[PDB]
């Protein structure tokens, strides 16, 4: 009862404020102007937007994942709760992007994604690191869903770096500080499995404490064990969807695991054959143009007799991960071995290091201010 005394009092206070949101932003200049003046912080005004991003999503996820029939939650929020706030004229501040990226978050859990196009187009206001890191969060996830593994893996690198010149300080990632650490860790780990004999960019993204364990995971996954298919997929699911609260686990109510059938089994199909793409590339491409010695050496390696070695070989070159040609008279297999790049880290660091100098020189000149 204490459970749904808290839950219901969030939504009823948000439904209250939703009317104030629509009322102030659009037309009442003097009410906005009166609100600019009185406090020393306009931070109180702005926080309440994306504070209610993740708290409302929790409360609606509970009501979603308790009532699976005669749907009250999902059409009320979708119609009224979300579109009224966002579709109409933005408040003049970062609040226009806050309500945008609150809506982008709400739009993310729903698996209907195609208006990521126009959400970026309506992000007219400048990309502050606060708004930008949370844009690249979802935009990278959108590329992860687009099967643009090579694009998305770069986008996850920067947001996990912790020299995007974040400083926070006053609770703008609060109570989920390490979610940004572990979700970017996790979703980057899936992308490494698909392609990698290219980056050589994983050094920047993830630190060696985790690179060591996730490194051996990919190898153990693709080569010799489907065990990593399990444990990777266990950690990947809470982070792929982001279901903010799983409901109280008990057998007396059912009500909760039924949505989790869909939610989970939706992502089963993702990692299923995308993982089995990996093992083909896993065997290093030892000799770039393969004669009879190496082509048969690789067709001994693909699968054994008899039936249907060549067919399966020529099915898998198509996907994205080989570029090659067949010759008839020679009987020769000629192929493409492409590689990435060595050092791209140093020249990106040359400014980052100078920020270690800068905020060094600056913070002590704030202490040199005080004790002088």
């Amino acid at each position: 009862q204490w459970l749904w005394d808290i839950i219901d009092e969030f939504i009823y206070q948000f439904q209250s404020f939703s009317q104030y949101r629509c009322k102030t932003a659009k037309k009442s200049e003097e009410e906005i102007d009166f609100l600019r003046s009185n406090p020393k912080i306009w931070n109180v005004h702005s926080v309440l937007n994306v504070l209610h991003s993740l708290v409302d999503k929790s409360n609606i996820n509970r009501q979603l994942e308790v009532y699976t029939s005669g749907g009250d939650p999902e059409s009320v929020a979708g119609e009224y709760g979300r579109h009224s706030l966002y579709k109409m004229l933005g408040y003049f501040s970062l609040v226009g992007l806050l309500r945008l990226h609150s809506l982008l978050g709400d739009y993310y859990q729903a698996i209907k994604v195609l208006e990521n196009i126009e959400l970026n187009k309506k992000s007219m206001y400048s990309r502050v690191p606060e708004c930008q890191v949370t844009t690249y969060y979802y935009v990278g996830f959108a590329y992860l869903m687009m099967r643009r593994y090579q694009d998305a893996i770069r986008v996850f690198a920067n947001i996990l770096l912790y020299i995007q010149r974040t400083k926070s300080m006053f609770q703008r990632t609060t109570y989920k500080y390490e979610m940004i650490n572990k979700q970017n860790e996790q979703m980057h780990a899936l992308l490494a499995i698909a392609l990698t004999m290219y980056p050589m960019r994983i050094d920047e993204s993830i630190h060696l404490q985790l690179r060591e364990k996730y490194g051996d995971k990919m190898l153990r996954m693709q080569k010799g064990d489907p065990q990593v298919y399990e444990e990777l997929f266990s950690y990947s699911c809470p982070k792929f969807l982001s279901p903010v609260v799983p409901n109280y686990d008990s057998v007396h109510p059912n009500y909760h695991k039924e949505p989790f059938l869909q939610q989970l089994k939706v992502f089963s199909d993702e990692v299923q054959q995308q993982a089995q793409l990996s093992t083909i590339r896993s065997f290093l491409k030892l000799y770039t143009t393969m004669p009879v010695a190496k082509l048969a050496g690789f067709l001994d390696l693909t699968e054994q007799e008899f039936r249907i070695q060549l067919l399966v070989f020529k099915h898998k070159m198509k996907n994205l991960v080989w570029t090659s040609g067949i010759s008839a008279l020679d009987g020769e297999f000629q192929s493409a071995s492409e590689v990435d790049f060595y050092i791209d880290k140093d020249m990106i660091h040359i400014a980052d290091t100078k920020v270690a100098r800068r905020y060094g020189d600056f913070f002590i000149r704030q202490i040199h201010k005080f004790e002088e």
């Binding site: 698996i111 570029t323 040609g325």
Partner: protein, 215 residues
């Protein structure tokens, strides 16, 4: 030409609050068949019907989802068909004709084109009933041939396209300008034109790095 007469209407439907209202399925399920029959496409209208079907599983209609699924598979290697299974329920992937359509879809992603045309059942008149579908999948076969072959044998390219005859293959030969070579393969692409490496070449980033190191 009913596709062109619903674009403006359905465009404002799918940007409003009518894409989480189930009542709009009248105009929307009609417009889904208008894609399939008239050989046109709109991902958003499909995905909204799929989302409204995911909302209330009872309103799911098998043929309307087949008209989504089949036309998703013409548009590969895009993630249109990825977004289909994401909204289609556990119950709803075991329906007819859905189960056969999904299995055939799996073959196209893993690019088992030989197995695709073997797998076909020819008594399902719905798969004949989608206009330009039989050629669309063939155009996607030849699309990926161009990306990852430098040559292909005449018998080989035939078999991938459903065991074509000599005369049937003349269309596909002419389509991307492909032509015969000595003994006796069909040319697809030049060897240096296919590979396209963008590998080792950087460390030419002097200008920016000196502009920031200027002071």
């Amino acid at each position: 030409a009913m596709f062109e007469q619903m674009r403006a209407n359905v465009g404002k439907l799918l940007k409003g609050i009518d894409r989480y209202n189930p009542e709009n399925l009248a105009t929307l399920e009609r417009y889904v068949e208008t894609q399939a029959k008239e050989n046109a496409y709109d991902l958003e209208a499909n995905l909204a019907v799929l989302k409204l079907y995911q909302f209330n599983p009872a309103f799911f209609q098998t043929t309307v989802t087949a008209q989504i699924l089949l036309k998703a598979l013409t548009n590969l290697p895009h993630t249109d068909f990825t977004l289909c299974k994401c909204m289609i329920d556990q119950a709803h992937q075991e329906e007819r004709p859905i189960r056969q359509i999904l299995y055939l879809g799996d073959l196209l992603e893993t690019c088992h084109f030989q197995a695709f045309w073997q797998a076909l059942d020819e008594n399902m008149d719905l798969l004949e009933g989608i206009t330009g579908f039989e050629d669309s999948v063939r155009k996607f076969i030849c699309h990926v041939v161009g990306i990852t072959y430098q040559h292909i044998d005449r018998w080989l390219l035939a078999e991938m396209l459903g065991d074509l005859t000599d005369s049937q293959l003349k269309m596909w030969m002419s389509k991307y300008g492909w032509s015969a070579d000595e003994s006796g393969q069909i040319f697809i692409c030049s060897q240096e034109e296919s590979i396209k490496p963008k590998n080792i070449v950087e460390k030419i980033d002097f200008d920016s790095v000196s502009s920031i190191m200027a002071s």
